[PDB]
Write an enzyme that holds these catalytic residues in place. Sequence first.
Site, mmCIF file in Angstrom:
data_model
loop_
_atom_site.group_PDB
_atom_site.id
_atom_site.type_symbol
_atom_site.label_atom_id
_atom_site.label_comp_id
_atom_site.label_asym_id
_atom_site.label_seq_id
_atom_site.Cartn_x
_atom_site.Cartn_y
_atom_site.Cartn_z
ATOM 1 N N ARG A 95 1.072 -1.360 -0.144
ATOM 2 C CA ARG A 95 -0.116 0.023 0.002
ATOM 3 C C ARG A 95 0.854 1.230 0.018
ATOM 4 N NH1 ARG A 95 -3.092 0.604 4.676
ATOM 5 N NH2 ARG A 95 -3.518 -1.481 4.378
ATOM 6 N N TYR A 147 -11.033 22.018 -14.189
ATOM 7 C CA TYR A 147 -11.958 20.729 -14.518
ATOM 8 C C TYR A 147 -12.917 20.472 -13.979
ATOM 9 C CZ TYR A 147 -12.139 15.496 -15.712
ATOM 10 O OH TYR A 147 -12.142 14.172 -16.272
ATOM 11 N N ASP A 198 -3.447 22.075 -10.651
ATOM 12 C CA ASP A 198 -3.595 21.076 -11.828
ATOM 13 C C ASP A 198 -2.808 21.097 -13.061
ATOM 14 O OD1 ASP A 198 -4.149 18.929 -13.778
ATOM 15 O OD2 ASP A 198 -6.287 18.648 -12.855
HETATM 16 C C1 P3F Z 1 -9.634 -6.784 7.704
HETATM 17 C C2 P3F Z 1 -8.912 -6.068 6.619
HETATM 18 N N1 P3F Z 1 -9.681 -5.085 5.985
HETATM 19 C C3 P3F Z 1 -8.857 -4.424 5.175
HETATM 20 C C4 P3F Z 1 -7.371 -4.346 5.098
HETATM 21 C C5 P3F Z 1 -6.750 -3.545 4.184
HETATM 22 O O1 P3F Z 1 -6.673 -3.842 2.791
HETATM 23 P P1 P3F Z 1 -5.416 -3.405 1.766
HETATM 24 O O2 P3F Z 1 -5.695 -4.063 0.501
HETATM 25 O O3 P3F Z 1 -5.834 -1.807 1.559
HETATM 26 O O4 P3F Z 1 -4.191 -3.696 2.344
HETATM 27 C C6 P3F Z 1 -6.769 -5.389 5.806
HETATM 28 C C7 P3F Z 1 -4.999 -5.586 5.964
HETATM 29 N N2 P3F Z 1 -4.079 -6.107 5.473
HETATM 30 N N3 P3F Z 1 -3.025 -5.826 6.511
HETATM 31 C C8 P3F Z 1 -2.449 -6.229 7.758
HETATM 32 O O5 P3F Z 1 -2.473 -7.294 8.240
HETATM 33 C C9 P3F Z 1 -1.592 -5.269 8.280
HETATM 34 N N4 P3F Z 1 -1.775 -3.872 8.007
HETATM 35 C C10 P3F Z 1 -1.444 -2.885 8.810
HETATM 36 O O6 P3F Z 1 -1.451 -2.928 10.235
HETATM 37 C C11 P3F Z 1 -1.447 -1.447 8.337
HETATM 38 C C12 P3F Z 1 -2.395 -0.507 8.764
HETATM 39 C C13 P3F Z 1 -2.354 0.546 8.146
HETATM 40 C C14 P3F Z 1 -1.238 1.298 7.479
HETATM 41 C C15 P3F Z 1 -0.304 0.197 7.118
HETATM 42 C C16 P3F Z 1 -0.502 -1.172 7.346
HETATM 43 C C17 P3F Z 1 0.671 -2.083 6.919
HETATM 44 F F1 P3F Z 1 1.362 -2.418 8.150
HETATM 45 F F2 P3F Z 1 1.257 -1.764 6.172
HETATM 46 F F3 P3F Z 1 0.093 -3.112 6.706
HETATM 47 C C18 P3F Z 1 -7.394 -6.277 6.637
HETATM 48 O O7 P3F Z 1 -6.866 -7.096 7.347
HETATM 49 C C1 P3F Z 2 -6.941 19.089 -16.398
HETATM 50 C C2 P3F Z 2 -7.640 17.434 -16.118
HETATM 51 N N1 P3F Z 2 -7.189 17.189 -14.924
HETATM 52 C C3 P3F Z 2 -7.620 15.842 -14.350
HETATM 53 C C4 P3F Z 2 -8.328 15.028 -15.237
HETATM 54 C C5 P3F Z 2 -8.679 13.898 -14.697
HETATM 55 O O1 P3F Z 2 -7.798 12.738 -14.852
HETATM 56 P P1 P3F Z 2 -8.414 11.370 -14.926
HETATM 57 O O2 P3F Z 2 -6.878 10.466 -14.957
HETATM 58 O O3 P3F Z 2 -9.080 10.992 -13.446
HETATM 59 O O4 P3F Z 2 -9.205 11.274 -16.287
HETATM 60 C C6 P3F Z 2 -8.611 15.464 -16.770
HETATM 61 C C7 P3F Z 2 -9.574 14.749 -17.514
HETATM 62 N N2 P3F Z 2 -9.722 13.845 -18.431
HETATM 63 N N3 P3F Z 2 -10.977 14.008 -18.979
HETATM 64 C C8 P3F Z 2 -11.665 14.866 -20.116
HETATM 65 O O5 P3F Z 2 -11.411 15.359 -21.064
HETATM 66 C C9 P3F Z 2 -13.358 14.595 -19.965
HETATM 67 N N4 P3F Z 2 -13.709 14.146 -18.738
HETATM 68 C C10 P3F Z 2 -15.002 14.387 -18.141
HETATM 69 O O6 P3F Z 2 -15.545 15.434 -18.630
HETATM 70 C C11 P3F Z 2 -15.625 13.727 -17.075
HETATM 71 C C12 P3F Z 2 -15.941 14.483 -15.744
HETATM 72 C C13 P3F Z 2 -16.147 13.967 -14.619
HETATM 73 C C14 P3F Z 2 -16.408 12.271 -14.654
HETATM 74 C C15 P3F Z 2 -16.398 11.630 -15.888
HETATM 75 C C16 P3F Z 2 -15.782 12.537 -17.038
HETATM 76 C C17 P3F Z 2 -15.469 11.915 -18.284
HETATM 77 F F1 P3F Z 2 -16.587 12.264 -19.071
HETATM 78 F F2 P3F Z 2 -15.862 10.368 -18.089
HETATM 79 F F3 P3F Z 2 -14.409 11.871 -18.938
HETATM 80 C C18 P3F Z 2 -8.282 16.767 -17.013
HETATM 81 O O7 P3F Z 2 -8.423 17.255 -18.332
#
Ligand code: P3F
Ligand code: P3F
Lengths: 392, 392, 391, 391
Positions: free
Chosen positions: D54, D107, D181
Amino acid sequence: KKLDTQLVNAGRSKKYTLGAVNSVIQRASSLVFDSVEAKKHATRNRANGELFYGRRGTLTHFSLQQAMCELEGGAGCVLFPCGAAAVANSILAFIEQGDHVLMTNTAYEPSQDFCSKILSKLGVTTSWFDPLIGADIVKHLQPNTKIVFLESPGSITMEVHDVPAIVAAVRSVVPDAIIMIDNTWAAGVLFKALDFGIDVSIQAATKYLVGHSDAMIGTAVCNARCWEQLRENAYLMGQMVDADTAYITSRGLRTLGVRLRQHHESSLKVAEWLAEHPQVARVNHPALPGSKGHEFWKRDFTGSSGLFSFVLKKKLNNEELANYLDNFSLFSMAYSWGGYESLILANQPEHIAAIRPQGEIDFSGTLIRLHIGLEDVDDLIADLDAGFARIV
Amino acid sequence: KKLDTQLVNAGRSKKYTLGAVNSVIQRASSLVFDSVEAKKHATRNRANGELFYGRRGTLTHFSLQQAMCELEGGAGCVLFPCGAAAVANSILAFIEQGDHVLMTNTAYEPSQDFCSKILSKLGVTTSWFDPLIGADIVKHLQPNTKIVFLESPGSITMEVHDVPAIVAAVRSVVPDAIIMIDNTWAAGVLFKALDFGIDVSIQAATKYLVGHSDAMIGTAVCNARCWEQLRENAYLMGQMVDADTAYITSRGLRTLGVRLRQHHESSLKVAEWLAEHPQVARVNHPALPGSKGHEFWKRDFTGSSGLFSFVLKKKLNNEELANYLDNFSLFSMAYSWGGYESLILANQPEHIAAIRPQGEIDFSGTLIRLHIGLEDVDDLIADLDAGFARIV
Amino acid sequence: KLDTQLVNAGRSKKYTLGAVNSVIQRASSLVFDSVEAKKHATRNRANGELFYGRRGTLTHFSLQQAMCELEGGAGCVLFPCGAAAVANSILAFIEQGDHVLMTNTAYEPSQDFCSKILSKLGVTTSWFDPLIGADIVKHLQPNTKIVFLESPGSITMEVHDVPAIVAAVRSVVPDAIIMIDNTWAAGVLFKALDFGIDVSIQAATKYLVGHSDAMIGTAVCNARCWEQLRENAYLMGQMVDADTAYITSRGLRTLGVRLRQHHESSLKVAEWLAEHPQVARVNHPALPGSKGHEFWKRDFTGSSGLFSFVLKKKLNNEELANYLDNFSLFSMAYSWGGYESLILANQPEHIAAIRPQGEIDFSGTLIRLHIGLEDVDDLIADLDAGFARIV
Amino acid sequence: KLDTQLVNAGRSKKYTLGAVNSVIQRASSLVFDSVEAKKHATRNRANGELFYGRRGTLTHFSLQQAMCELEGGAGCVLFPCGAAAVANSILAFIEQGDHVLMTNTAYEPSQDFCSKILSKLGVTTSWFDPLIGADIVKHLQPNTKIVFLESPGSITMEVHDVPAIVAAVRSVVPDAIIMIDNTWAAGVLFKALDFGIDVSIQAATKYLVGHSDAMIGTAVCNARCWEQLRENAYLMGQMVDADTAYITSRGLRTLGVRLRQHHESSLKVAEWLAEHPQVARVNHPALPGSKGHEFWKRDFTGSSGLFSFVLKKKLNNEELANYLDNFSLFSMAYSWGGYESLILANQPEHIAAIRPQGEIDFSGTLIRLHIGLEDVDDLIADLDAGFARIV
Ligand SMILES: Cc1ncc(COP(=O)(O)O)c(/C=N/NC(=O)CNC(=O)c2ccccc2C(F)(F)F)c1O
Ligand SMILES: Cc1ncc(COP(=O)(O)O)c(/C=N/NC(=O)CNC(=O)c2ccccc2C(F)(F)F)c1O
Ligand SMILES: Cc1ncc(COP(=O)(O)O)c(/C=N/NC(=O)CNC(=O)c2ccccc2C(F)(F)F)c1O
Ligand SMILES: Cc1ncc(COP(=O)(O)O)c(/C=N/NC(=O)CNC(=O)c2ccccc2C(F)(F)F)c1O
């Protein structure tokens, strides 16, 4: 219709993109038939762009294949795990015991070694020719010559073939020979091999087409005459490439024009500066006058890529060699080339003489092969310049 | 030390995992040498697990290779783009003009076609033997027999070889023959080919090792005697597999035990139920009494996978064939097998007779090949049961 | 039929296109062939018509269909990891002045998100004992917007009485959103939405992926809550990449054969540990006598391979190192739900600091095990050798 | 030297391990060989020692080093897409009672995040004209916590006077976090952190990736703001997958040769359009006379390929379809910054609804173009044919 437009669009039919900009990535071995009728229809069209079995390819392969046929003007594109696989397997596909293979002595070393170590024990003989032999190639043809194998520019030493003269000479004596070229330096596009009466244009797509030094793949684009036999015989050897690599290759095509123009511009500037340098004996860049086959390059090519070599006035001893090569800041030592980064390799005359069968070398100093990548050309010249100071 | 522990850990040295659970994915053609000294050290060890060039492999290949050598008890593992590539190229690696290849007539069809269409024109002859020939294989050996090619169980018809008797017979007459096996059904692990005095155990890793029908790769695990020649000669043909596929294959090993136990349990239950079924003439499952070579299976194997076939009492006409195959809900038609899903293919006796050189078939009804995947076995039996009702 | 559902979930022809697995469609831009076509996609942009990569491609739609059939939901919202799905699922339903009621056995980052992020947004959180059942009414405020469950609990493995909690919540705060972190159950051993829970969240990182190499969170919602979670998560830009979606779908295919082995092996280890002279207690939902085992037996259809136990002693730092540094098969790492077995230690003090409004009830070192796919007797042998290092 | 920096950025031996590109390390769990080693990783878990997926692997650390050198920052926080980086960067710095001041040219999803998510959290937002410069003091409240810029602006392409805005903000609300941005500039054509901006955000989805097939957001922070954004984003579970990180690093390598072609081609199209009888106005930062062009010329080192122009007419729906449905090379899609050329239309009414506290100043249909890597004369030919369809 211009190359840059072609490159952006090559292979991007809706049937392969399915709404996206790039082709989909279809990972598969099994392809499912919804009925006996569909299975029978797929069987009939199994070498013809219908989903049948992963070994024949998926939508992702079909897209790259279409793109390669468009860019090189071929009837078909056969795919391989790497350049060396495309070379060995393209030649194997057309030979039989008792055949003769005639190959430029400037051919990439593994290409020669395939002939000398694999073909020889299968009753197939090979001889070699000087890359500037031109129309005098007739002297090296035999009654049993099946393949004539070209590579232009040549590996390492960069000699350009007079392809028009060679082809005309071969056709005059053995019109049914299979003429093939390793067209990797040109990326299949700076030299249109198939327009020159060559039957098979082979590339290590690993180099410029991929362009980032992180995937390996070979391509052979075939005229109509040769496509079936190459394709079916390569299939019998189980030759294919994975769907992800095919995707990444098609994706590489997209920036190939902007990349090649930069490789061309920068490499020529470096080669000009090397040509004026006191420590430099000769520069082997196809785009540069005084380089072997330069006039054929000017006439027959539409561009240059970034690979070339130059010969030092000195033959470096081991310590000077380490001093020079070990202390570069931007050039790295590595094999392959055609990526975004600059590379440097040394070869001694004795090394090169040993991989030039039936021919003589023409230099006596240490040969340096440079790949000029996308860095700032002046930074690159500064690095080369510091190198020179290390061996003065 | 048990297989499940081996499978989890195979290939997972810290030098390949770098802190993670799985090996890293090292995508590369160029591998960089930091000095002339390092470049020279890498050159010396280029076939020996040191980074040298992408075509030889990266850390990701080295990890899979180590894992394969551990699981099959080999001195080396050579990698290929697919099973068919591992077959053709393993055989090519050991032959020369004037050699003889002796192959089971139950060999996968592309394996036979490689011999009959590629080898024959290179001055190499092939003959075939009945898979149950056992010690009488002596009758088929020639002075020039270089390779004896086994596949146990056989493709489609599933006959198990008496490997001990075959091997002993071959060694008694041509002790220096290269004995190879396509060991894909067993996934290299339910039958330890190298412990049986076989020189090369070849797999379509595409099947069980990958296990998900989305990557293609061939492996050949070699004894010490044969490894060098296989490896170097396959290298000259540019044979390799991409780093991502190698990763996914190592990753496949992790669940191979839990998967195979399920394939075994479920396929045997289906085969027992088929054996009691009125519309069924015979069941060809190696684990089932009355199946050809079953006694060798019991003695020599430590398990079963999920591929088998059965012979219908009827020879289906085209309409009954469509009716049967077109209307399944869980079985799909496709080639390959060894995935998580169930598959079904029909073959007519005439089709099979045509791919059994120097031998006769032993059935006259339509042959159905089943791959039993990971679905609920009763759901699978219900689908098969509905199929029977469609052709009563 | 779960094994059959797992094999087929999400594998419609429109997604697989001739292959066995779904295609992988990598995309940001999605091309509209006409202005009409662009209108149609726009009106269907949250309804599985290609519109923009941020909303997903064929590959995402495939995984979303699969999660929805496996957990019996109206929709499946995707996130870059489990912790993202938890933080963002809660955010999607709160506003300033709301109250959050969360099990004190919740994964620590779940608690931290509440105490460090929500608190500065005018949202209050308080906590409950996991075995509270119908007495949870005690803790329900008129402004309680979220009730957040985790069964079994992180680390200590206590199992909730979900039916009793849900009935109490509905009777007092019917407008509340009831959420569960259902990762231990891989969403399929406990059919949370069938118990009246609104949102079933998973770190798909765990058993769904199954190999410790892709990170992804999922939130399967009923029809009542899907639109809000989906649209509010989107405003936070939450998504997961197409290839991770592919790999998660792929994980499902072996989920049944995997979970059965994790169940069989973990329970055998647990049973052996419960009888061990150096062991105080074992916290395994499937083991008779474990906290909430009666609820596990009633409400679950299986077990996974994660559990914990308490040593009779509280190890000092030298002992801790001698015990943990010298294992041959168990590795030290965070996360779980892969093919390999893992070990982590927590001292009672550590646990006391992450049980808000609760009281710890053990004094020895707590050892959390993930039992992977290795031979179970090899694993018992490795633990046996570890016991020798600390006697 | 930018071309050289791009080629080498993030490619330390510890990341590439013998290869040219960084390795791809897919991982959730990261293994600690000992309890000591686990202590060391824990203390360095935000400082590039392997700890938990993560927080990232070698592949993420490589991209983070590269972004930091390219944009001159203390740290680089990663997100699943640009919209995630924007929403979460803002969230990371607010609390209830704060005020957000955002360009009305932001945006739309950036605006929506403020109006729909922040507002229910007790955070107010108001908006400013992009050409306000030092007169932005008008809009600064004592509780202004964030000033959010986008230069050039979405769609209409107005360029801010960043130095004038920054000076004004610092003089009145020195505690404010100034964010931009900076996607249009790919972070490298406008060195935002050198102008006194605190956080430079990118939809790396655009020019960094460069191929329209991976989604990712980045937020490069100065030392003042890095820790807060990093830790608060982490509590929201924000991350991006290892393979997308790899592909984004890979994009950088051709970023120079790409941007130069997008610059050269787009400006040629712009110049031709400005002279066209059917065209009212062209909005291209590099074109003399465009809104804020003086600031572009002074503060930027280049241009990308995204711009817009206004037709003399307001197309009706039949005309719109005839114009847009019949292009041979330009495709309709959202996003931009790939190798291919794109076209989208916006009617003045549409734009008027997303310029809060502003007033539109055109009446014809606005056409936004992304000029890709195709031959520029082919592209001009395609637009020329489009003009014929609407005369
Ligand atoms: C029930 C449950 N729900 C969600 C998560 C998190 O999922 P993900 O995919 O974000 O790792 C988990 C976690 N997997 N992690 C662990 O066993 C240990 N993690 C932490 O203590 C922790 C907590 C907060 C930030 C980092 C960490 C790190 F140490 F890096 F794992 C979980 O057990
Ligand atoms: C300056 C700038 N900053 C951030 C973003 C968004 O980035 P990302 O990687 O999340 O698409 C962008 C966008 N790319 N998107 C577009 O040209 C059009 N998007 C939307 O109007 C829009 C806005 C909100 C939700 C969906 C959309 C969708 F239509 F799907 F593109 C951007 O131009
Ligand atoms: C013109 C040409 N044609 C084909 C190839 C082969 O392509 P690929 O994709 O197989 O590496 C290439 C090769 N690029 N490689 C090199 O410059 C380095 N190659 C060798 O030193 C070499 C020579 C002989 C045998 C192996 C190798 C190995 F090092 F293994 F690359 C080539 O230059
Ligand atoms: C025992 C055995 N050994 C090797 C292979 C080949 O592996 P791979 O990885 O090359 O598909 C396989 C093949 N799996 N494939 C099939 O059952 C289907 N194959 C064919 O019909 C076939 C027969 C002959 C030629 C091609 C094909 C093609 F369809 F193209 F797969 C095998 O069963």
